[model samples]
Target: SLSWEIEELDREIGKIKKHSLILIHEEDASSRGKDILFYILSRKLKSDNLVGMFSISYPLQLIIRILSRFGVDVIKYLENHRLAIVDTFGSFHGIMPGVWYLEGMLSSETLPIKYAKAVEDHKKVWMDLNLFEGRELYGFAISMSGYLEVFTPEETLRYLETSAEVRYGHPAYKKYPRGTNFWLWEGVKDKRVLLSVYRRADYVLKTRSSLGENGIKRELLVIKTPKVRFEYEFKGNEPKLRREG
Candidate 1:
């Protein structure tokens, strides 16, 4: 079933057509959007296609769990380096093994700055170290590309406080400061917040889920897909979701 969705997305959304911003909206607070995106990402990209997440809530383990919900096995993917994460949210709890961390709680102007500075250090260390130094290990980095980063702001303040353009203080990180041009948006929906990211997103996705006797009805609409016209429906199945055209 996991591979089913993965293959489905790959067949439907082929090749990187645009360095586009994609907006994901849900009618409720549940994480169905995340499940859908992970299906798309894990299917389309190899483990080498790194994913950089903004918060602790989406730790590697958590993501693997979500993937499992769709019947995906992620052990080999992470073990062989098909996956890596630059995490900030988990540090709020405790550092996770084999994962990157950005210290301090993100709020106001300072957290973003702290994140940049911290990331700069990571770049220097990772680049110069015997492990990834000047090598193809640097191939298609999540931080360097406009394609990878996922941000989930629980409240609007998370966006407001960390909203400024993050300028990396260190020289090595000068080019990799991750501008907000690319998307992978997951967060609370507010009016100004909507205005902030809505106008610019390259591909916008919205999800609506409702429970009924037949099962839960899940609808995914593609507001903007420059590459293809996309829409999908999921009817609830006992073990997993069954797709209907």
Candidate 2:
């Protein structure tokens, strides 16, 4: 008979895989749910291939526990997989780090101090990732952060762009009046997208209540894009994924 722990693990993996499919397709659900799915998959696959495309959420202790289960070889495989995706996306563009950073900043009671500190930290990471390279990418982050309620996306974009133009000598303003696509993956029409939006909104609302106007600006203003369609292709050799209630 299967051990209770193994049985539970199997069940959790199934849930995660199912939810992950929903997320990739952009199904409607909570951001935390989506993160949970990604977290489990990354843990089980022991391969970075899938994890890198998604943001690294959850606490450090949890991450270590998950990683500890897999062998070194498996861990390396996952890391490589994740790295390829990150490379393709051109780093510093995704929602993972921003979300994590914002959450950390909001951990404190003082809103202004936390918000300002978080923005600075975000900028440091953003610069480190070389995300400030293209005008479009920078604007996209600012807009998305706002949309996700990380900061008033519109205001953040304006401030950053103007600062860039004056200090760096690059055209801080957007070259294309309209926005462009950044992430390219299958199943974008599913509930995952809705869930992500919902999660971010919730975070913003909750953080706002805690911080009030003193809280970080929580709005993301950007040109809306039409949904693109794609087919779902699962790797037949189902690796372990995680689940939850």
Candidate 2 structure quality by residue, lDDT tens digits, 1-245: 11111233334222211111121222223212223233334443342212222222223334445445432233344333222112111122333222333333231133334334433444454446554453221111212221223324344344434433432332211221111212211222323333443332311111100124653222111112111111111122222222312
TM-score, predicted candidate 2 vs. hidden true structure: 0.24
RMSD of 1: 7.3
> Residue 24 in model 2: shift from native, Å?
7.3
Q: Tell me which residue pairs clash in candidate 1.
A: 21-202, 47-82, 48-82, 55-89, 56-89, 56-90
In model 1, the Cα lDDT at residue 75 comes to 64
For each candidate, what TM-score against the reference? 0.59, 0.24
Off by over 4 Å in 1: 1-15, 29-31, 44-47, 58-61, 68-82, 94-97, 121-164, 167-189, 210-213, 225-245
* lDDT by residue for model 1 (1-245), tens: 11223344445554333233456554454526555655555543343333334434455567667667655556654454433455554554564333566565544445566656655555554444433422222211211111123344344445443533454244534644232222445444445555555565555666666676986666665566565323344333111333345
